[PDB]
Amino acid sequence: MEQLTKCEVFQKLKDLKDYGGVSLPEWVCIAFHTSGYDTQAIVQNNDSTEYGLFQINNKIWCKDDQNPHSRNICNISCDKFLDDDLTDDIVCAKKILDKVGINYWLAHKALCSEKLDQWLC
Ligand SMILES: [Ca+2]
């Protein structure tokens, strides 16, 4: 695993600032709640696997050995979301937000609405 600090996440996610109207603090909050800042996090379910900081699934967003019949919307191999370069992770996160919305990560819960200044570095 590779856990980052809150400040490292803040700096690394700069390019997501205000994307879709989501402020930087919200992205950091999303990252904390999604993978605890672990860029190598992998979570398995019966029919799918989620990868990295943004926990992008191999059912619709990326392709891996477990599911080669993935829609591969982000057109990339999931293992790409397990390294130190968040560049492609960010490119794909924007698509998820554009397409499904912030609830891909929040699941209808208001986990990143109050005291947002707490997620600032
Ligand atoms: Ca990456």
PDB file of C-alpha atoms and ligand atoms in Angstrom:
ATOM      1  CA  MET A   1       0.000   0.000   0.000  1.00  0.00           C
ATOM      2  CA  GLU A   2       0.982   3.652  -0.333  1.00  0.00           C
ATOM      3  CA  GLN A   3      -0.810   6.012   2.032  1.00  0.00           C
ATOM      4  CA  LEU A   4      -0.336   9.724   1.399  1.00  0.00           C
ATOM      5  CA  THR A   5      -0.819  12.552   3.893  1.00  0.00           C
ATOM      6  CA  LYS A   6      -3.761  14.964   3.574  1.00  0.00           C
ATOM      7  CA  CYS A   7      -1.458  17.727   2.375  1.00  0.00           C
ATOM      8  CA  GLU A   8       0.108  15.535  -0.315  1.00  0.00           C
ATOM      9  CA  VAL A   9      -3.363  14.650  -1.581  1.00  0.00           C
ATOM     10  CA  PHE A  10      -4.291  18.339  -1.566  1.00  0.00           C
ATOM     11  CA  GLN A  11      -1.301  19.233  -3.778  1.00  0.00           C
ATOM     12  CA  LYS A  12      -1.656  16.205  -6.052  1.00  0.00           C
ATOM     13  CA  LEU A  13      -5.329  16.875  -6.793  1.00  0.00           C
ATOM     14  CA  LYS A  14      -4.815  20.527  -7.746  1.00  0.00           C
ATOM     15  CA  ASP A  15      -5.987  19.974 -11.315  1.00  0.00           C
ATOM     16  CA  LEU A  16      -9.405  18.822 -10.070  1.00  0.00           C
ATOM     17  CA  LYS A  17     -10.068  22.186  -8.413  1.00  0.00           C
ATOM     18  CA  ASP A  18     -13.589  23.404  -9.180  1.00  0.00           C
ATOM     19  CA  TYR A  19     -14.037  20.756 -11.847  1.00  0.00           C
ATOM     20  CA  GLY A  20     -17.768  20.205 -12.242  1.00  0.00           C
ATOM     21  CA  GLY A  21     -17.982  22.775  -9.490  1.00  0.00           C
ATOM     22  CA  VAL A  22     -16.290  20.497  -6.941  1.00  0.00           C
ATOM     23  CA  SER A  23     -13.871  22.477  -4.796  1.00  0.00           C
ATOM     24  CA  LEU A  24     -10.450  21.108  -3.892  1.00  0.00           C
ATOM     25  CA  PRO A  25     -11.427  20.514  -0.239  1.00  0.00           C
ATOM     26  CA  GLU A  26     -14.297  18.329  -1.445  1.00  0.00           C
ATOM     27  CA  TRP A  27     -11.957  16.197  -3.579  1.00  0.00           C
ATOM     28  CA  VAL A  28      -9.666  15.656  -0.592  1.00  0.00           C
ATOM     29  CA  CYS A  29     -12.679  14.744   1.542  1.00  0.00           C
ATOM     30  CA  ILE A  30     -13.791  12.315  -1.183  1.00  0.00           C
ATOM     31  CA  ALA A  31     -10.316  10.772  -1.270  1.00  0.00           C
ATOM     32  CA  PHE A  32     -10.264  10.334   2.503  1.00  0.00           C
ATOM     33  CA  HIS A  33     -13.652   8.643   2.565  1.00  0.00           C
ATOM     34  CA  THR A  34     -12.953   6.498  -0.498  1.00  0.00           C
ATOM     35  CA  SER A  35      -9.532   4.992   0.149  1.00  0.00           C
ATOM     36  CA  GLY A  36      -8.044   6.700   3.187  1.00  0.00           C
ATOM     37  CA  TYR A  37      -5.447   8.320   0.906  1.00  0.00           C
ATOM     38  CA  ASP A  38      -4.048   4.936  -0.179  1.00  0.00           C
ATOM     39  CA  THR A  39      -3.133   5.134  -3.877  1.00  0.00           C
ATOM     40  CA  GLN A  40      -2.659   1.359  -4.019  1.00  0.00           C
ATOM     41  CA  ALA A  41      -5.960   0.462  -2.382  1.00  0.00           C
ATOM     42  CA  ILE A  42      -7.851  -2.447  -3.930  1.00  0.00           C
ATOM     43  CA  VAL A  43     -11.302  -3.433  -2.804  1.00  0.00           C
ATOM     44  CA  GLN A  44     -12.969  -6.596  -4.028  1.00  0.00           C
ATOM     45  CA  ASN A  45     -16.625  -7.503  -4.372  1.00  0.00           C
ATOM     46  CA  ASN A  46     -18.018 -10.710  -5.834  1.00  0.00           C
ATOM     47  CA  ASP A  47     -18.384  -9.398  -9.396  1.00  0.00           C
ATOM     48  CA  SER A  48     -15.922  -6.499  -9.430  1.00  0.00           C
ATOM     49  CA  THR A  49     -12.778  -4.809  -8.150  1.00  0.00           C
ATOM     50  CA  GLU A  50     -12.164  -1.120  -7.312  1.00  0.00           C
ATOM     51  CA  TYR A  51      -8.772   0.534  -7.767  1.00  0.00           C
ATOM     52  CA  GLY A  52      -6.675   3.251  -6.188  1.00  0.00           C
ATOM     53  CA  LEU A  53      -7.377   6.613  -4.605  1.00  0.00           C
ATOM     54  CA  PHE A  54     -10.692   7.032  -6.391  1.00  0.00           C
ATOM     55  CA  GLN A  55     -11.631   3.344  -6.273  1.00  0.00           C
ATOM     56  CA  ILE A  56     -12.500   3.129  -9.987  1.00  0.00           C
ATOM     57  CA  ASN A  57     -14.252  -0.144 -10.856  1.00  0.00           C
ATOM     58  CA  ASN A  58     -13.374  -2.708 -13.531  1.00  0.00           C
ATOM     59  CA  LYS A  59     -16.987  -3.195 -14.553  1.00  0.00           C
ATOM     60  CA  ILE A  60     -17.539   0.102 -16.354  1.00  0.00           C
ATOM     61  CA  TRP A  61     -14.457   2.323 -16.101  1.00  0.00           C
ATOM     62  CA  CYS A  62     -11.304   0.321 -16.648  1.00  0.00           C
ATOM     63  CA  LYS A  63     -10.216  -3.074 -17.950  1.00  0.00           C
ATOM     64  CA  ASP A  64      -8.367  -5.857 -16.120  1.00  0.00           C
ATOM     65  CA  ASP A  65      -7.896  -9.657 -16.223  1.00  0.00           C
ATOM     66  CA  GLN A  66     -10.929 -10.247 -14.026  1.00  0.00           C
ATOM     67  CA  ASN A  67     -13.282  -8.421 -16.391  1.00  0.00           C
ATOM     68  CA  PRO A  68     -12.090  -8.051 -20.015  1.00  0.00           C
ATOM     69  CA  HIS A  69     -15.703  -7.360 -20.981  1.00  0.00           C
ATOM     70  CA  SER A  70     -15.597  -4.050 -19.098  1.00  0.00           C
ATOM     71  CA  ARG A  71     -17.092  -0.989 -20.829  1.00  0.00           C
ATOM     72  CA  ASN A  72     -13.644   0.502 -20.299  1.00  0.00           C
ATOM     73  CA  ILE A  73     -15.021   4.058 -20.507  1.00  0.00           C
ATOM     74  CA  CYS A  74     -11.685   5.458 -19.376  1.00  0.00           C
ATOM     75  CA  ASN A  75      -9.925   3.287 -21.978  1.00  0.00           C
ATOM     76  CA  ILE A  76      -7.183   2.038 -19.705  1.00  0.00           C
ATOM     77  CA  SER A  77      -5.982  -0.921 -17.665  1.00  0.00           C
ATOM     78  CA  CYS A  78      -7.013  -0.696 -13.999  1.00  0.00           C
ATOM     79  CA  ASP A  79      -3.483  -1.391 -12.770  1.00  0.00           C
ATOM     80  CA  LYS A  80      -2.689   2.109 -13.966  1.00  0.00           C
ATOM     81  CA  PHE A  81      -4.618   3.432 -10.956  1.00  0.00           C
ATOM     82  CA  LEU A  82      -2.254   1.705  -8.517  1.00  0.00           C
ATOM     83  CA  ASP A  83       0.929   3.668  -9.145  1.00  0.00           C
ATOM     84  CA  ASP A  84       2.243   7.001  -7.883  1.00  0.00           C
ATOM     85  CA  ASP A  85       1.203   9.099 -10.894  1.00  0.00           C
ATOM     86  CA  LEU A  86      -2.317  10.408 -10.319  1.00  0.00           C
ATOM     87  CA  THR A  87      -2.442  12.026 -13.756  1.00  0.00           C
ATOM     88  CA  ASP A  88      -4.517   9.298 -15.408  1.00  0.00           C
ATOM     89  CA  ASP A  89      -6.530   8.657 -12.214  1.00  0.00           C
ATOM     90  CA  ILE A  90      -7.597  12.294 -12.373  1.00  0.00           C
ATOM     91  CA  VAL A  91      -8.476  12.113 -16.070  1.00  0.00           C
ATOM     92  CA  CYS A  92     -10.775   9.185 -15.316  1.00  0.00           C
ATOM     93  CA  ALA A  93     -12.268  10.742 -12.156  1.00  0.00           C
ATOM     94  CA  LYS A  94     -13.458  13.696 -14.243  1.00  0.00           C
ATOM     95  CA  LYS A  95     -15.322  11.297 -16.549  1.00  0.00           C
ATOM     96  CA  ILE A  96     -16.974   9.540 -13.608  1.00  0.00           C
ATOM     97  CA  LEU A  97     -18.085  12.899 -12.213  1.00  0.00           C
ATOM     98  CA  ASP A  98     -19.300  14.093 -15.632  1.00  0.00           C
ATOM     99  CA  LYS A  99     -21.156  10.834 -16.241  1.00  0.00           C
ATOM    100  CA  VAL A 100     -22.449   9.490 -12.920  1.00  0.00           C
ATOM    101  CA  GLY A 101     -21.912  12.334 -10.479  1.00  0.00           C
ATOM    102  CA  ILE A 102     -20.339  12.734  -7.055  1.00  0.00           C
ATOM    103  CA  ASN A 103     -22.528   9.926  -5.701  1.00  0.00           C
ATOM    104  CA  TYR A 104     -20.193   7.394  -7.293  1.00  0.00           C
ATOM    105  CA  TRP A 105     -18.133   8.081  -4.178  1.00  0.00           C
ATOM    106  CA  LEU A 106     -20.617   9.567  -1.680  1.00  0.00           C
ATOM    107  CA  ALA A 107     -23.577   7.249  -2.282  1.00  0.00           C
ATOM    108  CA  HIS A 108     -26.230   9.851  -1.398  1.00  0.00           C
ATOM    109  CA  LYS A 109     -24.587  10.683   1.908  1.00  0.00           C
ATOM    110  CA  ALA A 110     -23.554  14.239   2.779  1.00  0.00           C
ATOM    111  CA  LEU A 111     -20.029  13.385   3.912  1.00  0.00           C
ATOM    112  CA  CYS A 112     -18.415  16.378   2.217  1.00  0.00           C
ATOM    113  CA  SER A 113     -20.784  19.286   2.822  1.00  0.00           C
ATOM    114  CA  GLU A 114     -19.918  20.698   6.260  1.00  0.00           C
ATOM    115  CA  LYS A 115     -16.723  22.118   7.762  1.00  0.00           C
ATOM    116  CA  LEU A 116     -15.059  21.810   4.362  1.00  0.00           C
ATOM    117  CA  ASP A 117     -12.196  24.007   5.555  1.00  0.00           C
ATOM    118  CA  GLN A 118     -11.047  20.993   7.605  1.00  0.00           C
ATOM    119  CA  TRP A 119      -9.814  19.363   4.359  1.00  0.00           C
ATOM    120  CA  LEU A 120      -7.534  22.289   3.492  1.00  0.00           C
ATOM    121  CA  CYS A 121      -3.795  21.786   3.826  1.00  0.00           C
TER     122      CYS A 121
HETATM  123 CA    CA B   1      -1.943   6.424 -11.972  1.00  0.00          CA
END
